Amino acid sequence: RYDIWGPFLVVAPASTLHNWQQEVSKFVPDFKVLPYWGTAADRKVLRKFWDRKHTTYKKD
DNA sequence: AGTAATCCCCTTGGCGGTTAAAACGCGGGGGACAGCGCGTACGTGCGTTTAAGCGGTGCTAGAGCTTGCTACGACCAATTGAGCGGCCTCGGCACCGGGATTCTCCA
């Protein structure tokens, strides 16, 4: 309706996170998921995608 | 306010391989070590003299202690920017290869 396309946060208990990852992919096939969990080194590699410079995200 | 589950993180342990470093064998060389001769250089004893050590006298510098206060640092609250943690990148240093120069050793 408004092309906001994020950033959206989703904060869950740890047993549930793969359920979100999968059900999000099911309930929208074309909508893009960042799975921010793992060891500190793994999170550092994931954090590269947190763009601060746009407060509203493009579909790209 | 307590005690236990949950979850991060970071250390220890194991498995595989690969290859670079440790172990093993062997000839020979030359350095360790015992042996010899000499000779000069250090320990000994004596006579010499030199001044260190002691008992004693004299002075004043300055170590040590008290008094008095005010200049300087301890303490607190409000302000802010210098310095730290996190992210980025590109250029310095390593690593390789190949031909050029050096050094070593037997002739």
Short mmCIF file of all heavy atoms in Angstrom, two decimals, chain A:
data_model
loop_
_atom_site.label_atom_id
_atom_site.label_comp_id
_atom_site.label_asym_id
_atom_site.label_seq_id
_atom_site.Cartn_x
_atom_site.Cartn_y
_atom_site.Cartn_z
N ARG A 1 0.80 -1.22 0.00
CA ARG A 1 0.00 0.00 0.00
C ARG A 1 0.84 1.27 0.00
O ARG A 1 0.43 2.27 -0.60
CB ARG A 1 -0.94 -0.01 1.21
CG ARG A 1 -1.90 1.18 1.33
CD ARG A 1 -2.85 1.30 0.15
NE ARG A 1 -3.65 2.52 0.23
CZ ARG A 1 -3.23 3.73 -0.12
NH1 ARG A 1 -2.00 3.93 -0.57
NH2 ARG A 1 -4.06 4.76 -0.01
N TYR A 2 2.01 1.26 0.65
CA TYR A 2 2.79 2.48 0.86
C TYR A 2 4.26 2.32 0.49
O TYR A 2 5.02 3.29 0.63
CB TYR A 2 2.66 2.95 2.32
CG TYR A 2 1.24 3.27 2.73
CD1 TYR A 2 0.60 2.53 3.71
CD2 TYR A 2 0.53 4.30 2.12
CE1 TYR A 2 -0.70 2.81 4.10
CE2 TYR A 2 -0.76 4.60 2.51
CZ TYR A 2 -1.37 3.85 3.49
OH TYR A 2 -2.67 4.12 3.86
N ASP A 3 4.68 1.14 0.02
CA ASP A 3 6.06 0.87 -0.38
C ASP A 3 7.10 1.28 0.66
O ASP A 3 8.14 1.86 0.35
CB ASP A 3 6.36 1.52 -1.74
CG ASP A 3 5.60 0.85 -2.87
OD1 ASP A 3 6.05 -0.22 -3.34
OD2 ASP A 3 4.55 1.38 -3.29
N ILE A 4 6.81 0.97 1.93
CA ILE A 4 7.78 1.24 2.99
C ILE A 4 8.91 0.21 2.97
O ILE A 4 10.08 0.57 3.17
CB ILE A 4 7.07 1.27 4.36
CG1 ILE A 4 5.91 2.27 4.33
CG2 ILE A 4 8.05 1.67 5.45
CD1 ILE A 4 6.31 3.68 3.96
N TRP A 5 8.60 -1.06 2.71
CA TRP A 5 9.59 -2.13 2.49
C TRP A 5 10.70 -2.18 3.55
O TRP A 5 11.81 -2.63 3.26
CB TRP A 5 10.18 -2.05 1.09
CG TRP A 5 9.18 -2.30 0.00
CD1 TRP A 5 8.55 -1.36 -0.76
CD2 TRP A 5 8.74 -3.57 -0.49
NE1 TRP A 5 7.71 -1.97 -1.67
CE2 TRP A 5 7.82 -3.33 -1.52
CE3 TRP A 5 9.03 -4.89 -0.14
CZ2 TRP A 5 7.18 -4.36 -2.21
CZ3 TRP A 5 8.39 -5.92 -0.82
CH2 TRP A 5 7.48 -5.65 -1.85
N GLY A 6 10.42 -1.72 4.76
CA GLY A 6 11.37 -1.79 5.85
C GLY A 6 12.10 -0.51 6.19
O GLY A 6 11.82 0.55 5.62
N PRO A 7 13.06 -0.59 7.13
CA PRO A 7 13.47 -1.77 7.91
C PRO A 7 12.44 -2.18 8.95
O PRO A 7 11.95 -1.36 9.72
CB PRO A 7 14.78 -1.30 8.57
CG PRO A 7 14.60 0.17 8.74
CD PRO A 7 13.85 0.60 7.50
N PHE A 8 12.08 -3.46 8.99
CA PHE A 8 11.20 -4.02 10.00
C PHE A 8 11.98 -4.93 10.94
O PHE A 8 12.74 -5.79 10.48
CB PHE A 8 10.06 -4.81 9.35
CG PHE A 8 9.29 -4.04 8.34
CD1 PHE A 8 9.00 -4.59 7.11
CD2 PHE A 8 8.86 -2.76 8.61
CE1 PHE A 8 8.29 -3.88 6.17
CE2 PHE A 8 8.15 -2.04 7.67
CZ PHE A 8 7.86 -2.60 6.45
N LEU A 9 11.79 -4.74 12.24
CA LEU A 9 12.39 -5.63 13.22
C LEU A 9 11.38 -6.66 13.71
O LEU A 9 10.17 -6.40 13.75
CB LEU A 9 12.96 -4.83 14.39
CG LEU A 9 13.80 -5.63 15.38
CD1 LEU A 9 14.99 -6.23 14.68
CD2 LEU A 9 14.26 -4.74 16.52
N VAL A 10 11.89 -7.85 14.04
CA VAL A 10 11.11 -8.99 14.53
C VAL A 10 11.93 -9.66 15.62
O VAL A 10 12.92 -10.33 15.32
CB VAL A 10 10.77 -9.98 13.40
CG1 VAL A 10 10.10 -11.20 13.95
CG2 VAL A 10 9.87 -9.33 12.37
N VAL A 11 11.52 -9.50 16.88
CA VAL A 11 12.31 -9.98 18.01
C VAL A 11 11.59 -11.14 18.69
O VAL A 11 10.45 -10.98 19.17
CB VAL A 11 12.59 -8.85 19.02
CG1 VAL A 11 13.65 -9.27 20.01
CG2 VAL A 11 12.98 -7.57 18.31
N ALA A 12 12.25 -12.28 18.76
CA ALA A 12 11.65 -13.56 19.09
C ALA A 12 12.46 -14.28 20.15
O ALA A 12 13.62 -13.94 20.40
CB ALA A 12 11.55 -14.44 17.84
N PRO A 13 11.86 -15.27 20.83
CA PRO A 13 12.67 -16.24 21.59
C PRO A 13 13.42 -17.18 20.66
O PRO A 13 12.98 -17.48 19.55
CB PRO A 13 11.63 -16.97 22.45
CG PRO A 13 10.34 -16.24 22.26
CD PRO A 13 10.43 -15.58 20.94
N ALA A 14 14.57 -17.65 21.14
CA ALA A 14 15.56 -18.30 20.28
C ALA A 14 15.06 -19.60 19.65
O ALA A 14 15.48 -19.94 18.53
CB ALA A 14 16.84 -18.56 21.07
N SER A 15 14.18 -20.35 20.33
CA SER A 15 13.59 -21.54 19.71
C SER A 15 12.71 -21.24 18.50
O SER A 15 12.45 -22.15 17.71
CB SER A 15 12.79 -22.32 20.75
OG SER A 15 11.81 -21.50 21.37
N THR A 16 12.25 -20.00 18.34
CA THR A 16 11.25 -19.65 17.34
C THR A 16 11.84 -19.06 16.06
O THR A 16 11.11 -18.89 15.08
CB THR A 16 10.25 -18.65 17.92
OG1 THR A 16 10.85 -17.36 17.95
CG2 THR A 16 9.89 -19.02 19.35
N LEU A 17 13.14 -18.74 16.06
CA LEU A 17 13.72 -17.88 15.03
C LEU A 17 13.73 -18.53 13.65
O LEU A 17 13.48 -17.86 12.65
CB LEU A 17 15.14 -17.52 15.44
CG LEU A 17 15.24 -16.69 16.72
CD1 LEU A 17 16.67 -16.60 17.18
CD2 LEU A 17 14.68 -15.31 16.44
N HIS A 18 14.00 -19.83 13.58
CA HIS A 18 13.91 -20.54 12.30
C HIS A 18 12.48 -20.69 11.82
O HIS A 18 12.24 -20.80 10.61
CB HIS A 18 14.59 -21.90 12.41
CG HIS A 18 16.08 -21.81 12.54
ND1 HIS A 18 16.88 -21.36 11.51
CD2 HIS A 18 16.91 -22.10 13.57
CE1 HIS A 18 18.14 -21.38 11.91
NE2 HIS A 18 18.19 -21.83 13.15
N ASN A 19 11.51 -20.71 12.73
CA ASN A 19 10.11 -20.68 12.32
C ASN A 19 9.75 -19.37 11.64
O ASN A 19 9.08 -19.37 10.60
CB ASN A 19 9.21 -20.93 13.52
CG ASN A 19 7.76 -21.12 13.12
OD1 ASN A 19 7.46 -21.89 12.21
ND2 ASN A 19 6.86 -20.40 13.78
N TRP A 20 10.18 -18.24 12.20
CA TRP A 20 10.01 -16.95 11.53
C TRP A 20 10.71 -16.92 10.18
O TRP A 20 10.10 -16.61 9.16
CB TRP A 20 10.52 -15.83 12.43
CG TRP A 20 9.56 -15.41 13.49
CD1 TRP A 20 9.62 -15.70 14.82
CD2 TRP A 20 8.39 -14.59 13.32
NE1 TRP A 20 8.56 -15.13 15.48
CE2 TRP A 20 7.79 -14.45 14.58
CE3 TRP A 20 7.79 -13.96 12.22
CZ2 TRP A 20 6.63 -13.71 14.78
CZ3 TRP A 20 6.64 -13.23 12.42
CH2 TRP A 20 6.07 -13.11 13.69
N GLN A 21 12.00 -17.28 10.16
CA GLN A 21 12.75 -17.31 8.90
C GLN A 21 12.00 -18.07 7.81
O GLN A 21 11.95 -17.62 6.66
CB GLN A 21 14.12 -17.95 9.14
CG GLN A 21 15.01 -17.97 7.91
CD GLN A 21 16.30 -18.73 8.16
OE1 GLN A 21 16.42 -19.49 9.11
NE2 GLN A 21 17.28 -18.53 7.28
N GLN A 22 11.43 -19.22 8.15
CA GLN A 22 10.73 -20.05 7.17
C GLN A 22 9.32 -19.55 6.87
O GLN A 22 8.95 -19.40 5.69
CB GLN A 22 10.72 -21.50 7.66
CG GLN A 22 12.10 -22.11 7.67
CD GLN A 22 12.15 -23.45 8.35
OE1 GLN A 22 11.12 -24.07 8.61
NE2 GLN A 22 13.36 -23.92 8.64
N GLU A 23 8.51 -19.28 7.90
CA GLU A 23 7.14 -18.82 7.67
C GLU A 23 7.10 -17.45 6.98
O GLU A 23 6.20 -17.20 6.17
CB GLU A 23 6.37 -18.77 8.99
CG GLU A 23 6.09 -20.13 9.64
CD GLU A 23 5.20 -21.01 8.79
OE1 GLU A 23 5.72 -21.72 7.90
OE2 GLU A 23 3.97 -21.01 9.02
N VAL A 24 8.04 -16.56 7.29
CA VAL A 24 8.17 -15.32 6.53
C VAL A 24 8.40 -15.61 5.05
O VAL A 24 7.77 -15.01 4.17
CB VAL A 24 9.29 -14.43 7.10
CG1 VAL A 24 9.52 -13.23 6.21
CG2 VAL A 24 8.93 -13.96 8.50
N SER A 25 9.32 -16.54 4.76
CA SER A 25 9.57 -16.91 3.37
C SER A 25 8.36 -17.57 2.72
O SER A 25 8.13 -17.40 1.52
CB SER A 25 10.79 -17.84 3.31
OG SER A 25 11.92 -17.23 3.90
N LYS A 26 7.57 -18.31 3.50
CA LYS A 26 6.34 -18.88 2.97
C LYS A 26 5.29 -17.81 2.71
O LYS A 26 4.77 -17.68 1.59
CB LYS A 26 5.80 -19.94 3.94
CG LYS A 26 4.63 -20.75 3.39
CD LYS A 26 4.14 -21.75 4.42
CE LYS A 26 3.14 -22.73 3.81
NZ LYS A 26 1.86 -22.06 3.45
N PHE A 27 4.97 -17.01 3.72
CA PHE A 27 3.88 -16.05 3.61
C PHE A 27 4.21 -14.82 2.78
O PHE A 27 3.29 -14.11 2.40
CB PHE A 27 3.43 -15.61 5.01
CG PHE A 27 2.74 -16.68 5.78
CD1 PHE A 27 3.26 -17.13 6.98
CD2 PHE A 27 1.58 -17.26 5.30
CE1 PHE A 27 2.63 -18.14 7.69
CE2 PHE A 27 0.95 -18.26 6.01
CZ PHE A 27 1.47 -18.70 7.20
N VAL A 28 5.48 -14.58 2.46
CA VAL A 28 5.81 -13.74 1.30
C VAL A 28 7.07 -14.27 0.62
O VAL A 28 8.17 -14.15 1.18
CB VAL A 28 6.03 -12.26 1.67
CG1 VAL A 28 6.25 -11.51 0.39
CG2 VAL A 28 4.87 -11.65 2.44
N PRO A 29 6.96 -14.85 -0.57
CA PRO A 29 8.15 -15.36 -1.27
C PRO A 29 9.13 -14.29 -1.72
O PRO A 29 10.31 -14.61 -1.90
CB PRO A 29 7.55 -16.10 -2.48
CG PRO A 29 6.15 -16.46 -2.05
CD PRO A 29 5.71 -15.28 -1.23
N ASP A 30 8.70 -13.05 -1.92
CA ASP A 30 9.49 -12.01 -2.58
C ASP A 30 9.91 -10.89 -1.63
O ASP A 30 10.11 -9.75 -2.05
CB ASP A 30 8.72 -11.44 -3.77
CG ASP A 30 8.44 -12.48 -4.83
OD1 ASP A 30 9.23 -13.44 -4.94
OD2 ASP A 30 7.44 -12.34 -5.57
N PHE A 31 10.05 -11.20 -0.34
CA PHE A 31 10.29 -10.22 0.70
C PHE A 31 11.46 -10.71 1.55
O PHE A 31 11.49 -11.88 1.94
CB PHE A 31 8.96 -10.07 1.45
CG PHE A 31 8.98 -9.27 2.71
CD1 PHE A 31 8.98 -7.89 2.67
CD2 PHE A 31 8.82 -9.90 3.93
CE1 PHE A 31 8.92 -7.16 3.84
CE2 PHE A 31 8.77 -9.19 5.09
CZ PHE A 31 8.82 -7.81 5.06
N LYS A 32 12.42 -9.83 1.82
CA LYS A 32 13.82 -10.21 2.03
C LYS A 32 14.20 -10.20 3.51
O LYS A 32 13.99 -9.20 4.21
CB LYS A 32 14.74 -9.30 1.23
CG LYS A 32 16.15 -9.85 0.99
CD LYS A 32 16.92 -8.99 0.00
CE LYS A 32 18.31 -9.55 -0.27
NZ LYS A 32 18.26 -10.81 -1.06
N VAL A 33 14.78 -11.31 3.97
CA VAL A 33 14.94 -11.62 5.39
C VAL A 33 16.42 -11.55 5.78
O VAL A 33 17.27 -12.14 5.11
CB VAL A 33 14.37 -13.01 5.71
CG1 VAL A 33 14.36 -13.26 7.21
CG2 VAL A 33 12.97 -13.15 5.12
N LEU A 34 16.72 -10.82 6.86
CA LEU A 34 18.04 -10.91 7.49
C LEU A 34 17.97 -11.73 8.77
O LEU A 34 17.29 -11.32 9.72
CB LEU A 34 18.59 -9.52 7.80
CG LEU A 34 20.04 -9.52 8.29
CD1 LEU A 34 21.00 -9.84 7.15
CD2 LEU A 34 20.39 -8.20 8.95
N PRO A 35 18.65 -12.89 8.84
CA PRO A 35 18.68 -13.76 10.04
C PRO A 35 19.84 -13.43 10.98
O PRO A 35 20.89 -14.07 11.00
CB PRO A 35 18.81 -15.16 9.44
CG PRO A 35 19.65 -14.93 8.21
CD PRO A 35 19.30 -13.54 7.69
N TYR A 36 19.66 -12.39 11.79
CA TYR A 36 20.74 -11.88 12.65
C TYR A 36 20.90 -12.73 13.91
O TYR A 36 20.39 -12.40 14.98
CB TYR A 36 20.45 -10.43 13.00
CG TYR A 36 21.58 -9.72 13.69
CD1 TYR A 36 22.67 -9.23 12.99
CD2 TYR A 36 21.57 -9.54 15.06
CE1 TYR A 36 23.71 -8.59 13.64
CE2 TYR A 36 22.60 -8.90 15.72
CZ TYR A 36 23.67 -8.43 15.00
OH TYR A 36 24.69 -7.78 15.65
N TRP A 37 21.62 -13.84 13.77
CA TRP A 37 22.04 -14.63 14.93
C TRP A 37 23.24 -15.49 14.56
O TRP A 37 23.51 -15.73 13.38
CB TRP A 37 20.91 -15.50 15.48
CG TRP A 37 20.30 -16.40 14.46
CD1 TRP A 37 20.79 -17.58 14.02
CD2 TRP A 37 19.04 -16.22 13.80
NE1 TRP A 37 19.95 -18.13 13.10
CE2 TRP A 37 18.86 -17.32 12.95
CE3 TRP A 37 18.06 -15.22 13.84
CZ2 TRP A 37 17.73 -17.46 12.14
CZ3 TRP A 37 16.95 -15.36 13.03
CH2 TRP A 37 16.79 -16.47 12.20
N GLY A 38 23.95 -15.97 15.58
CA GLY A 38 25.22 -16.65 15.42
C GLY A 38 26.25 -16.12 16.39
O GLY A 38 25.96 -15.31 17.28
N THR A 39 27.48 -16.61 16.25
CA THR A 39 28.59 -16.09 17.04
C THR A 39 28.88 -14.64 16.69
O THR A 39 28.43 -14.12 15.66
CB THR A 39 29.85 -16.93 16.84
OG1 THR A 39 30.37 -16.69 15.52
CG2 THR A 39 29.55 -18.41 16.99
N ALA A 40 29.63 -13.97 17.57
CA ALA A 40 29.92 -12.55 17.39
C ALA A 40 30.54 -12.26 16.03
O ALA A 40 30.16 -11.29 15.36
CB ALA A 40 30.84 -12.07 18.51
N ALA A 41 31.48 -13.11 15.60
CA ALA A 41 32.06 -12.98 14.27
C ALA A 41 31.03 -13.13 13.16
O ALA A 41 31.09 -12.42 12.15
CB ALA A 41 33.18 -14.01 14.10
N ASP A 42 30.08 -14.05 13.32
CA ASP A 42 29.02 -14.21 12.33
C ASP A 42 28.09 -13.00 12.28
O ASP A 42 27.65 -12.60 11.20
CB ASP A 42 28.21 -15.47 12.63
CG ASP A 42 29.08 -16.69 12.83
OD1 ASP A 42 30.01 -16.89 12.02
OD2 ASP A 42 28.83 -17.45 13.79
N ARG A 43 27.78 -12.42 13.44
CA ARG A 43 26.93 -11.23 13.47
C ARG A 43 27.63 -10.02 12.85
O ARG A 43 27.01 -9.25 12.11
CB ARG A 43 26.50 -10.94 14.91
CG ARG A 43 25.66 -12.07 15.49
CD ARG A 43 24.81 -11.66 16.67
NE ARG A 43 25.53 -10.94 17.70
CZ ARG A 43 26.27 -11.51 18.64
NH1 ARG A 43 26.52 -12.81 18.64
NH2 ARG A 43 26.80 -10.75 19.60
N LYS A 44 28.93 -9.85 13.12
CA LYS A 44 29.73 -8.82 12.45
C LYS A 44 29.64 -8.91 10.93
O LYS A 44 29.54 -7.88 10.25
CB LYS A 44 31.18 -8.94 12.90
CG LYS A 44 32.10 -7.80 12.46
CD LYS A 44 33.52 -8.03 12.94
CE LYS A 44 34.47 -6.95 12.43
NZ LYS A 44 34.49 -5.74 13.29
N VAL A 45 29.69 -10.12 10.38
CA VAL A 45 29.53 -10.29 8.93
C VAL A 45 28.10 -9.99 8.48
O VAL A 45 27.90 -9.44 7.38
CB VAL A 45 29.95 -11.72 8.53
CG1 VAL A 45 29.62 -12.00 7.07
CG2 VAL A 45 31.44 -11.92 8.80
N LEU A 46 27.10 -10.30 9.30
CA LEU A 46 25.72 -9.97 8.95
C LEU A 46 25.43 -8.48 9.05
O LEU A 46 24.64 -7.94 8.26
CB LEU A 46 24.77 -10.75 9.86
CG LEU A 46 24.66 -12.24 9.57
CD1 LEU A 46 24.16 -12.98 10.79
CD2 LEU A 46 23.74 -12.48 8.39
N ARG A 47 26.04 -7.79 10.01
CA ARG A 47 25.76 -6.38 10.26
C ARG A 47 26.13 -5.47 9.09
O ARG A 47 25.67 -4.32 9.05
CB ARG A 47 26.47 -5.94 11.54
CG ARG A 47 25.82 -4.77 12.24
CD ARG A 47 26.63 -4.37 13.45
NE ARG A 47 26.69 -5.44 14.43
CZ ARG A 47 27.81 -5.96 14.91
NH1 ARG A 47 29.00 -5.49 14.56
NH2 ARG A 47 27.74 -6.96 15.78
N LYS A 48 26.95 -5.95 8.15
CA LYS A 48 27.29 -5.19 6.95
C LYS A 48 26.06 -4.70 6.17
O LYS A 48 26.15 -3.72 5.43
CB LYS A 48 28.14 -6.05 6.02
CG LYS A 48 29.36 -6.67 6.66
CD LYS A 48 30.28 -5.65 7.27
CE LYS A 48 31.53 -6.32 7.79
NZ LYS A 48 32.42 -5.38 8.51
N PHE A 49 24.93 -5.38 6.30
CA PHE A 49 23.71 -5.06 5.56
C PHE A 49 22.79 -4.05 6.25
O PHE A 49 21.79 -3.66 5.64
CB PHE A 49 22.97 -6.36 5.26
CG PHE A 49 23.83 -7.39 4.57
CD1 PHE A 49 24.08 -8.62 5.16
CD2 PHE A 49 24.42 -7.11 3.36
CE1 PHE A 49 24.88 -9.55 4.54
CE2 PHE A 49 25.23 -8.04 2.73
CZ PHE A 49 25.46 -9.26 3.32
N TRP A 50 23.09 -3.63 7.48
CA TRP A 50 22.30 -2.61 8.18
C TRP A 50 22.64 -1.23 7.62
O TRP A 50 23.52 -0.54 8.13
CB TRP A 50 22.60 -2.63 9.68
CG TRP A 50 22.27 -3.86 10.42
CD1 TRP A 50 21.93 -5.08 9.92
CD2 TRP A 50 22.29 -4.00 11.84
NE1 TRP A 50 21.73 -5.96 10.95
CE2 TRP A 50 21.94 -5.32 12.14
CE3 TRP A 50 22.57 -3.12 12.89
CZ2 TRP A 50 21.87 -5.79 13.45
CZ3 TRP A 50 22.49 -3.59 14.19
CH2 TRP A 50 22.14 -4.90 14.45
N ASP A 51 21.93 -0.83 6.57
CA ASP A 51 22.10 0.51 6.00
C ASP A 51 21.45 1.56 6.90
O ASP A 51 20.23 1.59 7.06
CB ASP A 51 21.49 0.55 4.60
CG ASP A 51 21.64 1.90 3.93
OD1 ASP A 51 22.34 2.78 4.48
OD2 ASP A 51 21.06 2.08 2.85
N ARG A 52 22.28 2.44 7.49
CA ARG A 52 21.78 3.56 8.29
C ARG A 52 21.32 4.75 7.46
O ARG A 52 20.53 5.56 7.95
CB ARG A 52 22.85 4.06 9.27
CG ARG A 52 23.09 3.22 10.50
CD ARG A 52 23.69 1.87 10.17
NE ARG A 52 24.21 1.21 11.36
CZ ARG A 52 25.14 0.27 11.35
NH1 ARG A 52 25.57 -0.27 10.22
NH2 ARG A 52 25.62 -0.18 12.51
N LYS A 53 21.81 4.87 6.22
CA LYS A 53 21.74 6.12 5.48
C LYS A 53 20.37 6.38 4.85
O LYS A 53 20.08 7.53 4.49
CB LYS A 53 22.83 6.12 4.40
CG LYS A 53 24.21 5.85 4.99
CD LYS A 53 25.30 5.89 3.94
CE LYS A 53 26.66 5.62 4.57
NZ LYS A 53 27.77 5.71 3.59
N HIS A 54 19.54 5.36 4.71
CA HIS A 54 18.14 5.50 4.33
C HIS A 54 17.27 5.08 5.50
O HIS A 54 17.40 3.96 6.01
CB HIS A 54 17.81 4.65 3.10
CG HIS A 54 18.69 4.91 1.92
ND1 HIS A 54 19.87 4.24 1.72
CD2 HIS A 54 18.54 5.76 0.87
CE1 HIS A 54 20.43 4.67 0.60
NE2 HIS A 54 19.64 5.59 0.07
N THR A 55 16.39 5.98 5.94
CA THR A 55 15.43 5.63 6.98
C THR A 55 14.24 4.85 6.44
O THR A 55 13.45 4.33 7.23
CB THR A 55 14.94 6.89 7.71
OG1 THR A 55 14.36 7.80 6.76
CG2 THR A 55 16.10 7.57 8.42
N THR A 56 14.09 4.78 5.12
CA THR A 56 13.09 3.93 4.48
C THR A 56 13.78 3.12 3.39
O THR A 56 14.51 3.68 2.57
CB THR A 56 11.95 4.75 3.88
OG1 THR A 56 11.38 5.58 4.90
CG2 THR A 56 10.88 3.84 3.32
N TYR A 57 13.54 1.81 3.37
CA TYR A 57 14.28 0.94 2.47
C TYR A 57 13.61 0.79 1.11
O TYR A 57 12.39 0.71 1.00
CB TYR A 57 14.50 -0.45 3.07
CG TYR A 57 15.61 -0.50 4.08
CD1 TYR A 57 16.30 0.65 4.43
CD2 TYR A 57 16.03 -1.70 4.62
CE1 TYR A 57 17.32 0.62 5.34
CE2 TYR A 57 17.07 -1.75 5.53
CZ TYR A 57 17.71 -0.58 5.89
OH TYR A 57 18.76 -0.64 6.77
N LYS A 58 14.45 0.77 0.08
CA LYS A 58 14.09 0.43 -1.28
C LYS A 58 13.91 -1.08 -1.40
O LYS A 58 14.47 -1.86 -0.61
CB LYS A 58 15.18 0.92 -2.23
CG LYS A 58 15.44 2.42 -2.12
CD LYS A 58 16.51 2.89 -3.09
CE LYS A 58 16.80 4.37 -2.91
NZ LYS A 58 17.84 4.86 -3.85
N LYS A 59 13.11 -1.51 -2.38
CA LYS A 59 12.97 -2.94 -2.61
C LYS A 59 14.30 -3.59 -3.00
O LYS A 59 14.47 -4.80 -2.79
CB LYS A 59 11.89 -3.21 -3.66
CG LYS A 59 11.40 -4.66 -3.64
CD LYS A 59 10.10 -4.89 -4.41
CE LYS A 59 10.23 -4.73 -5.91
NZ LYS A 59 8.93 -5.05 -6.57
N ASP A 60 15.23 -2.82 -3.56
CA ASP A 60 16.59 -3.30 -3.81
C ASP A 60 17.41 -3.56 -2.55
O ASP A 60 18.45 -4.22 -2.65
CB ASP A 60 17.36 -2.29 -4.67
CG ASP A 60 16.79 -2.16 -6.06
OD1 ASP A 60 15.83 -2.88 -6.39
OD2 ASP A 60 17.32 -1.32 -6.83
#
